[PDB]
Amino acid sequence: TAKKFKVVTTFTIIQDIAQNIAGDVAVVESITKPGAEIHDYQPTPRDIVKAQSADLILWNGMNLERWFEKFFESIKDVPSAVVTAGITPLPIREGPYSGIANPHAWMSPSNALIYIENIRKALVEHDPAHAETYNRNAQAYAEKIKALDAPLRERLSRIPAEQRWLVTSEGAFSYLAKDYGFKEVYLWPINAEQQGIPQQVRHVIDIIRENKIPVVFSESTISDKPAKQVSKETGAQYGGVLYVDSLSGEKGPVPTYISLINMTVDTIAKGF
Numbered sequence: 001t002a003k004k005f006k007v008v009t010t011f012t013i014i015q016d017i018a019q020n021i022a023g024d025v026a027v028v029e030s031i032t033k034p035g036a037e038i039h040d041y042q043p044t045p046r047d048i049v050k051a052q053s054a055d056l057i058l059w060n061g062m063n064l065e066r067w068f069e070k071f072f073e074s075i076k077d078v079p080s081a082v083v084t085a086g087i088t089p090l091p092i093r094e095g096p097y098s099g100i101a102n103p104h105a106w107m108s109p110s111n112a113l114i115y116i117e118n119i120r121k122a123l124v125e126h127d128p129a130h131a132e133t134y135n136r137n138a139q140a141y142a143e144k145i146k147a148l149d150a151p152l153r154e155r156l157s158r159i160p161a162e163q164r165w166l167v168t169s170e171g172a173f174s175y176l177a178k179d180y181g182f183k184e185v186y187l188w189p190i191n192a193e194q195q196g197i198p199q200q201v202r203h204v205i206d207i208i209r210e211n212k213i214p215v216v217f218s219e220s221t222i223s224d225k226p227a228k229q230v231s232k233e234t235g236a237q238y239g240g241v242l243y244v245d246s247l248s249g250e251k252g253p254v255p256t257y258i259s260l261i262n263m264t265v266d267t268i269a270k271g272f
């Protein structure tokens with residue numbers, strides 16, 4: 001037990017999944033901090049030194065981290081791995097990124113099994129002295145993820161099909177909405193600098209008309225104001241905050257990936 005194998009991830013969700021696979025035999029750190037916007041994060045010099053100190057770097061791919069490839073050019077002799085390998089992307093459906101992969105694949109718990117296997121495989125490949133701990137921890141964590149499916153569906157089972165509309169600010173929930181039979185509506189399709197600020201807001205306020213959607217949400221790394229506005233101009237309650245792009249701090253409501261899924265579904269459910 002000298003200095004432990006060091007893994008650096010781009011953001012907090014991957015950090016928590018990887019630390020569950022690593023257990024005590026490896027140290028997993030995230031480049032972005034809890035609460036920080038991850039799509040257009042601007043790396044600092046201290047971020048370079050952190051990534052350069054790693055034995056292995058994990059990132060999402062599906063162009064989630066618009067900043068990563070340019071950043072990674074400053075890192076030498078450190079292998080990286082894309083943890084969404086083998087996931088089939090859902091395309092973005094409107095706006096200037098229409099047709100690009102929707103990168104929020106981790107919001108489907110069945111996809112998280114694929115994240116887990118990609119991370120396990122990378123850990124075993126580059127740290128083979130601990131292949132037994134990594135292989136045991138991954139199987140145990142995959143079983144925790146599989147166990148979520150029944151309580152999650154049961155928690156949402158009081159909402160009838162026609163009523164299952166999920167109205168959020170970022171369209172970050174397409175993978176979760178597909179898994180649990182929700183229709184998605186959103187103020188913008190993916191976080192970015194962009195136009196369409198008030199026109200999608202009026203188009204969303206539209207769809208809330210004929211479907212009498214009762215509740216709309218925001219998310220933890222972006223401004224809650226546009227959702228709160230939509231709630232004002234309609235009769236819909238503001239139900240947010242949902243979690244997708246970041247965990248909370250270790251003492252906050254959402255310190256782990258499992259707590260992020262459970263609490264996001266729980267908040268949708270109570271919103272209805």
Ligand SMILES: [Zn+2]
Nearest residue numbers: 001025129130
């Ligand atoms: Zn050891």
Ligand SMILES: [Zn+2]
Nearest residue numbers: 004005127129
């Ligand atoms: Zn080691």
Ligand SMILES: [Zn+2]
Nearest residue numbers: 079081122125
């Ligand atoms: Zn490798």
Ligand SMILES: [Zn+2]
Nearest residue numbers: 131132133136
């Ligand atoms: Zn043993």
Ligand SMILES: [Zn+2]
Nearest residue numbers: 094185186203
């Ligand atoms: Zn739309």
Ligand SMILES: [Zn+2]
Nearest residue numbers: 170172191245
């Ligand atoms: Zn996002």
